[PDB]
Each structure stands twice: as structure tokens, then as C-alpha cells.
Design a protein around this ligand. Structure first.
Ligand SMILES: Cc1cc2c(-c3cncc(CO)c3)cnc(NC3CCN(CCCN)CC3)c2[nH]c1=O
Ligand SMILES: Cc1cc2c(-c3cncc(CO)c3)cnc(NC3CCN(CCCN)CC3)c2[nH]c1=O
Length: 134
């Protein structure tokens, strides 16, 4: 419940909604696949991912650094490559979602590094506090 984790999560939620979800024709990736339009989806894809699941994860503060966040963004691209193939319009769009995500992280690199560094410090400060109690 530290202010650095709250600020970091807030930044990630903003990148998702304001930049990634704003990618033209990205709407099929904004929510989990609807099994009606794609009956064999969950047979083919073992680990499904979408922009809504990521926002729910951000809300639960799953991501303490941009790397675990990147693992879930990259899983969206790899799922599209497997299910629709590399030539698919769905994969080209998934790739564009990934490119804008990396671009926004690059643009906010110093802010994010500082927050990641502060989240790390708060966790270490919490453990030394639980040792001074005796
Ligand atoms: C069939 C379809 C759905 C859809 C859904 C959608 C689909 N399923 C569920 C839900 C709700 O939970 C939403 C969401 N946004 C769409 N497109 C808009 C078009 C205008 N864009 C801005 C352009 C600015 N000049 C932003 C995206 C969609 N376009 C579609 O063709
Ligand atoms: C995210 C996604 C959606 C999608 C939707 C779709 C569109 N509107 C709404 C909804 C509701 O979720 C889904 C429809 N057809 C897709 N692509 C085809 C499916 C058949 N494939 C052959 C596989 C044979 N084993 C070739 C590519 C989709 N592929 C996707 O990756």
C-alpha cells in the first residue's frame, strides 16, 4: 500500500488505456477472446492474455517493475503469432501494441527507474523495520 507502488501502477494503467488501447484496430485485444467467434481459441492457447487482464493485474499491483509487465504484453503478441500466424492482421496489430508500449516506457524511462528503485527500497525498509521490533 506504499505511494511509490500506487504511482507506478497508475503510470502502467495510463500507458495501457491512453497509448496501447489507442492503437488503430486494437479493440479485439482490449478484452479476453469471446469463445463464440473463436471456438478453438482456448485449445490452441494455453496461457491467454489481453489488455483487460493486464489492467486487473495493475489494480492488484502484480507489477513491481516494468519487466513482469513486459512479460504479459509480450505474451499477447506471442499468442497472436501462434493462433493467427505471422502474416495475420491480428499479429501486425499485436506487434503495434508492443511497439507503442516499449516506446512509452522509453519516453518515461527515468521516472519509472526512480519508482522501481523506490519500490525496492520500501520493501527493504519494511523488512529492517520487522527486525528492529525484537
Ligand atoms: C465489433 C467492434 C467492437 C468494438 C469494441 C468492443 C468490442 N467488444 C466489447 C466491447 C465492450 O466491452 C467493446 C470497442 N471499440 C471498437 N472500436 C472503436 C472505434 C473508434 N475508435 C476511436 C477512433 C477515433 N477516430 C476506438 C475503438 C469496436 N469496434 C468493432 O468493430
Ligand atoms: C484476439 C483475436 C480475435 C479474433 C476474432 C474475433 C473478432 N471479433 C470479436 C472476437 C471476440 O473475442 C473475436 C476472430 N477471428 C480471429 N482470427 C482468425 C480465427 C481463425 N484462425 C484460424 C485458426 C485455426 N486453428 C485464423 C485467424 C481472432 N483472432 C485473435 O487473435
Amino acid at each position: 500500500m506504499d505511494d511509490d507502488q500506487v504511482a507506478f501502477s497508475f503510470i502502467l494503467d495510463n500507458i495501457v488505456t491512453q497509448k496501447m488501447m489507442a492503437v488503430p484496430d486494437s479493440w479485439p485485444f482490449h478484452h479476453p477472446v469471446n469463445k463464440k467467434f473463436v471456438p478453438d481459441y482456448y485449445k490452441v492457447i494455453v496461457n491467454p492474455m489481453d489488455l483487460e487482464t493486464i489492467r486487473k493485474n495493475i489494480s492488484k499491483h502484480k507489477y513491481q517493475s516494468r519487466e513482469s509487465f513486459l512479460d504479459d504484453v509480450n505474451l499477447i503478441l506471442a499468442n497472436s503469432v501462434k493462433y493467427n500466424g505471422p502474416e495475420s492482421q491480428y499479429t501486425k496489430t499485436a506487434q503495434e501494441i508492443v511497439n507503442v508500449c516499449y516506446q512509452t516506457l522509453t519516453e518515461y524511462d527515468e521516472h519509472l527507474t526512480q519508482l522501481e528503485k523506490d519500490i525496492c527500497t520500501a520493501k527493504e525498509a519494511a523488512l529492517e523495520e520487522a527486525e528492529l521490533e525484537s
